[PDB]
Motif scaffolding. Sequence first.
Motif, short mmCIF file in Angstrom:
data_model
loop_
_atom_site.label_atom_id
_atom_site.label_comp_id
_atom_site.label_asym_id
_atom_site.label_seq_id
_atom_site.Cartn_x
_atom_site.Cartn_y
_atom_site.Cartn_z
N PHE A 1 -23.71 -34.43 -27.48
CA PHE A 1 -23.16 -34.72 -26.16
C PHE A 1 -21.95 -35.65 -26.21
CE2 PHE A 1 -27.81 -34.07 -24.97
CZ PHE A 1 -27.61 -32.75 -24.63
N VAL A 2 -22.09 -36.83 -26.80
CA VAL A 2 -21.07 -37.88 -26.71
C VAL A 2 -20.51 -38.12 -28.11
CG1 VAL A 2 -20.61 -40.29 -26.21
CG2 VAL A 2 -22.07 -38.94 -24.68
N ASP A 3 -19.23 -37.83 -28.29
CA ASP A 3 -18.53 -38.14 -29.53
C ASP A 3 -17.88 -39.51 -29.40
OD1 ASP A 3 -16.95 -37.04 -27.54
OD2 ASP A 3 -15.47 -36.23 -28.95
N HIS A 4 -17.01 -39.86 -30.35
CA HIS A 4 -16.40 -41.18 -30.41
C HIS A 4 -14.91 -41.16 -30.07
CE1 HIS A 4 -14.21 -41.07 -34.42
NE2 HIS A 4 -14.80 -39.90 -34.37
N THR A 5 -14.45 -40.16 -29.33
CA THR A 5 -13.05 -40.02 -28.96
C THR A 5 -12.92 -39.65 -27.49
OG1 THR A 5 -13.22 -37.87 -30.05
CG2 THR A 5 -11.97 -39.59 -31.18
N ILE A 6 -13.64 -40.36 -26.62
CA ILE A 6 -13.62 -40.10 -25.19
C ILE A 6 -12.67 -41.06 -24.50
CG2 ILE A 6 -14.98 -40.47 -23.10
CD1 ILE A 6 -17.32 -39.08 -24.63
N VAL A 7 -12.90 -42.36 -24.69
CA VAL A 7 -12.08 -43.37 -24.03
C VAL A 7 -10.65 -43.32 -24.55
CG1 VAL A 7 -11.86 -45.82 -23.53
CG2 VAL A 7 -14.13 -44.79 -23.69
N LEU A 8 -10.49 -43.10 -25.85
CA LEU A 8 -9.15 -42.98 -26.41
C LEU A 8 -8.41 -41.79 -25.79
CD1 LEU A 8 -6.95 -43.80 -28.40
CD2 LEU A 8 -8.09 -42.40 -30.12
N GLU A 9 -9.10 -40.66 -25.62
CA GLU A 9 -8.48 -39.50 -25.00
C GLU A 9 -8.08 -39.82 -23.56
OE1 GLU A 9 -10.74 -35.91 -25.19
OE2 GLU A 9 -10.62 -35.78 -27.38
N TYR A 10 -8.97 -40.46 -22.81
CA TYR A 10 -8.66 -40.80 -21.42
C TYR A 10 -7.41 -41.67 -21.34
CZ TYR A 10 -9.24 -42.50 -16.65
OH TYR A 10 -9.04 -42.82 -15.33
N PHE A 11 -7.37 -42.74 -22.12
CA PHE A 11 -6.26 -43.69 -22.02
C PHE A 11 -4.99 -43.20 -22.71
CE2 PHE A 11 -9.64 -46.88 -21.13
CZ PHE A 11 -9.14 -47.29 -19.92
N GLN A 12 -5.08 -42.18 -23.57
CA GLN A 12 -3.88 -41.52 -24.05
C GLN A 12 -3.32 -40.56 -23.01
OE1 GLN A 12 -4.74 -39.77 -27.87
NE2 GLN A 12 -3.79 -41.46 -28.98
N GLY A 13 -4.19 -39.90 -22.25
CA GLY A 13 -3.72 -39.02 -21.20
C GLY A 13 -3.24 -39.74 -19.95
N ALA A 14 -3.70 -40.97 -19.73
CA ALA A 14 -3.29 -41.70 -18.54
C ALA A 14 -1.87 -42.25 -18.64
CB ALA A 14 -4.26 -42.85 -18.26
N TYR A 15 -1.33 -42.37 -19.85
CA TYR A 15 -0.02 -42.98 -20.07
C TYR A 15 0.95 -41.96 -20.63
CZ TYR A 15 -2.06 -47.56 -19.23
OH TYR A 15 -2.66 -48.65 -18.65
N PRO A 16 1.80 -41.33 -19.81
CA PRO A 16 2.73 -40.33 -20.36
C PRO A 16 3.72 -40.90 -21.36
CG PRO A 16 3.30 -40.87 -18.09
CD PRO A 16 1.99 -41.54 -18.37
N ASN A 17 4.15 -42.15 -21.19
CA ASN A 17 5.12 -42.78 -22.07
C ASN A 17 4.39 -43.67 -23.07
OD1 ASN A 17 7.27 -43.94 -23.34
ND2 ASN A 17 8.20 -44.83 -21.50
N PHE A 18 4.79 -43.59 -24.34
CA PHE A 18 4.02 -44.24 -25.40
C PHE A 18 4.23 -45.74 -25.45
CE2 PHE A 18 3.03 -45.59 -29.71
CZ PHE A 18 1.77 -45.05 -29.86
N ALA A 19 5.38 -46.25 -25.02
CA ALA A 19 5.56 -47.70 -25.00
C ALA A 19 4.48 -48.36 -24.16
CB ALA A 19 6.95 -48.04 -24.46
N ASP A 20 4.17 -47.75 -23.01
CA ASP A 20 3.13 -48.30 -22.14
C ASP A 20 1.78 -48.32 -22.85
OD1 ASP A 20 5.25 -48.28 -20.44
OD2 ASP A 20 4.47 -46.73 -19.11
N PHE A 21 1.43 -47.23 -23.54
CA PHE A 21 0.15 -47.18 -24.23
C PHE A 21 0.08 -48.22 -25.35
CE2 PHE A 21 -2.67 -45.03 -27.44
CZ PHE A 21 -3.84 -45.32 -26.77
N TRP A 22 1.16 -48.37 -26.11
CA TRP A 22 1.19 -49.36 -27.18
C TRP A 22 0.96 -50.76 -26.62
CZ3 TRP A 22 3.56 -53.46 -29.70
CH2 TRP A 22 3.36 -53.52 -31.08
#
Lengths: 72, 69, 81, 478, 245
Positions: free
Chosen positions: B1-22
């Motif tokens: 059911f639950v893998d270890h790449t859920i929150v990372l996927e969410y917060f990578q998709g929420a930020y279109p520009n990478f400077a913001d994510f960094w």
Amino acid sequence: NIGGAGSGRPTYTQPALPKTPAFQLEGEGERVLNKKKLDELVRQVCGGTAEGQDGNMLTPEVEESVLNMADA
Amino acid sequence: FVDHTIVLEYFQGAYPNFADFWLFRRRFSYQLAALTFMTYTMHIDKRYPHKMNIARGSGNIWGSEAVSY
Amino acid sequence: VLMEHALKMNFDLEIRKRYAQPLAVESGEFPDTSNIESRMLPFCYEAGLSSGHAPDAAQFMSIATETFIKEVMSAIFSRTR
Amino acid sequence: WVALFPMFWSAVPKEDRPDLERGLVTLLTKDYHSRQMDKRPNVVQSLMAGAVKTWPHCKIPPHVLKFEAKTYDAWYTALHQLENAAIKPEIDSAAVRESNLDALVDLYSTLGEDDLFYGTWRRRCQFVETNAGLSYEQHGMWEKAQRMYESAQIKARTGVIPFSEAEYMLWEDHWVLCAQKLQQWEILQDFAKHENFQDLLLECAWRNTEYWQNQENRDQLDTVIKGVMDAPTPRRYFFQAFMSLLKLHNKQETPQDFNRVVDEAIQLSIRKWHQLPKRLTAAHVPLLQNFQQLVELHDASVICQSLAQTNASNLDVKSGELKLLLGSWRDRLPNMWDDIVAWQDLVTWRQHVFGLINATYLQLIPSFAYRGYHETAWIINRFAHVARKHALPEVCISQLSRIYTLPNIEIQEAFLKLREQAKCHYQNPDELTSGLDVINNTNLNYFSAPQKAEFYTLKGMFLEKLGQKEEADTAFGT
Amino acid sequence: TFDAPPYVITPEYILKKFAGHPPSLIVHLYQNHFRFDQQEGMFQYKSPMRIFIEHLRNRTVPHEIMEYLIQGGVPFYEGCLIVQVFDHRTTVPFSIHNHNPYITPSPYVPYPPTVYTVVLMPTAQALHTDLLLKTVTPRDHMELDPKNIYEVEAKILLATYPKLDLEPTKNAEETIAKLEKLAHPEHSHKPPEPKVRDEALAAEQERYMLTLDERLSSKLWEPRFERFKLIENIKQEHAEKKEQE
């Protein structure tokens, strides 16, 4: 790159616009051209070589003498 | 059911520009360290996942309902 | 002869680099602009030329070496073919 | 363009991609792009972003990205791929991984990210002494880091266990850095002289105030400065500007040339500030300090000009004029948490200027002409306090003890000396001998009531540790 | 007077005559390097010190390092040497996911000798080097003026060879027999031999990926710790000077 400290060191550390290094994407390479240089010279001064043979124009004992000549 | 790449996927998709994510991740690390110290030394007990608030605007973390056990 | 056979710039740290580069006979590569350029500086520092050498000397030296070798090889070939 | 490029790259047959990749790499490194450095939306950024938006199917060498980002302001586009390829390498090969990690670490170093640098290096090392040294240097314990690096080198000398060249260079570089942070300049000067390091030699020579007074010494230094000027940088330009100021002070140059030098330095500093990311990062602080340095350089030039011109007629009235400017300077200081080297540079520059003033004013007297000594004492005391707050062993003590000899006993200097003496009580263990000797006798206590009272309180608290309850009781009751 | 060696020197005679004496040198052999007993560093088989290994293979005194040996006072036995040989010869590097007790787990992994003794014979080059070194060693001043070199060498040769074969023969057969009898093991070799002269895609990919790499590109390494030794020397000098003050 002036200063003498060295370049490419992966440690803790600039001009406005540094100069790009030299690179070659794909080709024969220097390791082949330098070795072929001597045979090229022999071909030039020998007059010409017929089809189906080349390279082996100097015996192993003469190439060493030629290289020593050049270095000296 | 639950893998270890859920929150990372969410917060990578929420930020279109990478400077913001960094920048967000850089702040998030420090904030998590501070919260960990606070929770460890004072013996806070029931740290359910709905008690961690994350500020998407800057990266702050606030752990609600913090009472010693 | 017997001894040989038995603020400021450290001019003795750049002369010693002369032996780092392998000789042509050692490697098998005919000397080119790169090797000659590497070899130039220690000689200049030994003789006292602090400034160095002109930018376009390596190509001149390479051309001269090529001409010398070609002349010698041509001389050897004419008397036996 | 960033929206279009992935869609069209998805339509290239798989057997043909390498040709396009090589052509793209060739196009990225062309020489005519330098006519676009300043325009913010420029083709290099767009090409790099388009390539990196589809990284798994469009491979670009790490070092091409690293080289182009530093010049065309594409830092985070580079970092994206650089630190995504560490998790899931594209190709299985040790050399590729090593090169990628090297590029990533270089970018982290340039951007000023200390913690990420150390964390990346501590997962790459092989020895345990390197790991310990990095972890100790992270927390600002320089002596321990130096000792661990030395032990690592000594163990590696045996050769029983193989190592790499990256660690070999790291040991030397970080030993030098730790020595720099600990004020071990005496040996660093000779090391640089032997090893032919021009920049390190200049940094070491700049710390000797008297060395710049002899005409022959400065003539010799001018050759080094001119030698390292074919690759101008902000620090080299600062050194050239300082040399020009010294030349002007001795009526060997016109003010116009000095102004031109300062203008060139300012332009270079602005050009380098324009290349960093827009939002204030940790790589902007040194440039702010450089701005302050240039402004103070111009102020000191005006100081020297006015001093010389007014003292040409022996008019001892400009002391009041200098007082305003010194007072203004007294409020421009870094923040207590700034790097120690910033404080070192500030102190050294102020000492140079004050020495110039003292030299000009000493030849005239043979009270009002002994301000340089007071200013030097004040700045030394402030730096000593800051160094103590930084937990630097013996640096604070070294600075407080190097001021033993200073002439012109005055009220200001006497008060500063008394403040230093009060500061001698660090409240550290095993320092009982010095405290007992001070209690035995130390100068006089007739100066001022608060000073003697705090001295008595310090004596009482020192006695408290030894267990002299009633002695300390009486002392601080009095 | 000193006892003179035989016509032919062999390991058995020298080892037996000097048995119970300390060996001249001790050498340890590893997979790709060797070192001496009190040496702290190491030497590679590809470094300039390959001459020592070649001499050991050929059983000849290494005249090239004669002065270095003389500085250390290495012992000589009848002009030869005795050498002891010790034969020690007989994960996912550069990945950030490796574990180590001093590192975090990382969330992309499931979870955490034979001993030999040989003798080296002397040569003429050794004597030439000995005399040359003695010529330039200050003690007159110098330890040996050149003009006496010939007399000194004459006396040394007289001491080394005390007896010679001076019996005339009478015909070709006797001379042939004498030549056959007197043959030497070290001068009976044979004449030498005439001097003589799918993955590509992966190699190309690696070379391409290593583009514009300042240092790693060229290679695609013999540490000496020179900077460390210089730092140690300067530190010692500074401390010693501070001793006076």
